């Protein structure tokens, strides 16, 4: 849902107020990815320990 | 094609062996050129020598 | 080249190590990216 | 750009399209200044 | 800039018909329709009718069959000739300029047109001069009496229109077949009895022009 | 474009298209002359 996908690209283009709003959602997105990861990883462990 | 006013043109040059119909081939087109035209497209016709 | 420097090249800007590679760039291909949206390689505008 | 383009008695050579059928899509022009129809009423020239 | 004011008509009797002449200035007249109305006889402002540009016109349906429109291309001049007036039919008339959505952006001036069947009279002018016990503070307060003149309008004016600070124009009073006009202005005292004071009275109808001395 | 003689009406509103150069933004940015000077998905003073 942010402007752009890449960080340089809206920190090259947007002021401070307005990067950290679209940083924000890909801060919670690419969060949420690798706790999935995570979250999937782990289980996946428990079934090959 | 017209994407957001910019009339995109693309092209591809090759030999072929055919003596019927469209022959049966797969080869991906490149860019050509890229015009921003802005004009709505509805027909269109081909020149013939 | 094959230096970590902070580079910028019409707008794709970012960390990398300038390197010549073995990739064969079409004249309309201006800059590569890999699947993560990250740039893999660049056309110089100055010296194409 | 009062001090420039207003002039005494008012400065009309900008105009704009009052209204229009449908809404223009993103950079869209139209210099056409034929009468188009308000209602069902069929003009074909003549305002009125 | 803009100009499209009315003249022409001075008395009219009723059921009877007349000619209006109304200069358009500031634009030309094959790139706006001149719209025709009137001015409150009575109820709400009306509407008469509208030359589009080089084309046909509309007409009021309670006038299309008397009111006509003679737009003078040529001349940069609008006519228009009524037929079967009634004395209802009393007020200013006015041309404006076709707008976007058949707006009428500009207004003119018009003229008081006047329907009776009483017959036309110069105005007999008589000032208000204040007697020589006349007493001032700081300023004085001076007019006329314009009685017995027939159409409307009359202007008063204080030395040819020169004070402007308290000028007040009254409305005519309806007397038998004339009207009574009065005025009120002000201006301070060392203008009179020092310097020279005249009312200036000018009848568009009758064209007269009265000076009398206050 | 900006000290133009005159512009055009908003709705023959000219596309002036921009290629093959270079220009200073501060400059506008900064020149202390514009009534309204508001960006929409980029920075003026970054886009330099």
């Known amino acids: 849902g942010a402007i752009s996908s890449v960080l340089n690209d809206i920190l090259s283009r947007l002021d401070p107020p307005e990067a950290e709003v679209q940083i924000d959602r890909l801060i919670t997105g690419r969060l949420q990815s690798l706790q999935t990861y995570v979250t999937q990883q782990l289980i996946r462990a428990a079934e090959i320990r | 094609k017209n994407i957001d006013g910019y009339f995109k043109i693309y092209s591809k040059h090759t030999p072929i062996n055919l003596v019927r119909d469209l022959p049966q081939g797969f080869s991906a087109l490149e860019p050509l050129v890229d015009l921003p035209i802005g004009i709505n497209i509805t027909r269109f016709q081909t020149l013939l020598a | 080249k094959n230096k970590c420097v902070n580079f910028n090249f019409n707008g794709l800007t970012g960390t990398g190590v300038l390197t010549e590679s073995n990739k064969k760039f079409l004249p309309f291909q201006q800059f590569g990216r890999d699947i993560a949206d990250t740039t893999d390689a660049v056309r110089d505008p100055q010296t194409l | 750009s009062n001090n420039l383009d207003s002039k005494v008695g008012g400065n009309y050579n900008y105009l704009y399209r009052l209204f229009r059928k449908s809404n223009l899509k993103p950079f869209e022009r139209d210099i056409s200044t034929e009468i188009y129809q308000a209602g069902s009423t069929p003009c074909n020239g003549v305002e009125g | 800039q803009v100009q499209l004011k009315q003249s022409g008509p001075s008395l009219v009797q009723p059921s009877q018909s007349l000619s209006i002449t109304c200069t358009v200035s500031?634009?030309?007249?094959?790139?706006?329709?001149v719209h025709w109305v009137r001015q409150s006889p009575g109820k709400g402002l009306e509407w008469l009718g509208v030359?589009?540009?080089?084309?046909?016109?509309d007409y009021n349906a309670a006038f299309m069959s008397r009111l006509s429109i003679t737009k003078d291309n040529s001349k940069s001049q609008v006519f228009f000739k009524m037929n079967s007036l009634q004395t209802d039919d009393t007020a200013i008339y006015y041309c404006?300029?076709?707008?976007?959505?058949?707006?009428?952006?500009?207004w003119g001036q018009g003229t008081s047109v006047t329907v009776s069947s009483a017959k036309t009279t110069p105005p007999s002018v008589y000032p208000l001069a204040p007697g020589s016990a006349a007493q001032t503070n700081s300023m004085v307060t001076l007019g006329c009496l314009v009685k017995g003149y027939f159409p409307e309008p009359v202007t008063v004016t204080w030395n040819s229109g020169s004070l402007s600070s308290g000028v007040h124009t009254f409305p005519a009073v309806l007397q038998s077949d004339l009207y009574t006009l009065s005025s009120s202005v002000t201006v301070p005292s060392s203008t009179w009895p020092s310097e020279t004071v005249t009312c200036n009275v000018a009848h568009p109808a009758s064209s007269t022009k009265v000076d009398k001395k206050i | 474009v900006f000290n133009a003689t005159r512009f055009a009406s908003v709705y023959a509103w000219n596309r002036k298209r921009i290629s093959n150069c270079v220009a200073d933004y501060s400059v506008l940015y900064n020149s202390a002359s514009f009534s309204t000077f508001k960006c929409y998905g980029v920075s003026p003073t970054k886009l330099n």
């Open positions: 404006a300029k076709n707008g976007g959505a058949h707006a009428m952006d500009f």
């Open positions: 500031g634009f030309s007249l094959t790139s706006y329709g």
């Open positions: 030359m589009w540009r080089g084309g046909n016109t």
